[PDB]
Design a protein around this ligand. Structure first.
Ligand code: CU1
Length: 73
């Protein structure tokens, strides 16, 4: 089992690429993740999933940008 928790991350999404790259990573997590939202303006990324915090932090930064911080909700 897992329940869907709401994670929020701040990733340094300044180039018109990394947004797409994270999104592409999301495309693999889709059949597990419940919901996603992504914001360049406010340099933040909200993901509603089962998968643990650390996994997502890695997954995000993996794409190239740094992950500044995040939290769970
Ligand atoms: Cu970027």
């Amino acid at each position: 089992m897992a329940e869907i928790k709401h994670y929020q991350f701040n990733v340094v999404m300044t180039c018109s690429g990394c947004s797409g790259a994270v999104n592409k990573v999301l495309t693999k997590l889709e059949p597990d993740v419940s919901k996603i939202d992504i914001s360049l303006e406010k340099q933040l990324v909200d993901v509603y999933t089962t998968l643990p915090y650390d996994f997502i932090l890695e997954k995000i930064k993996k794409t190239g940008k740094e992950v500044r911080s995040g939290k769970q909700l």
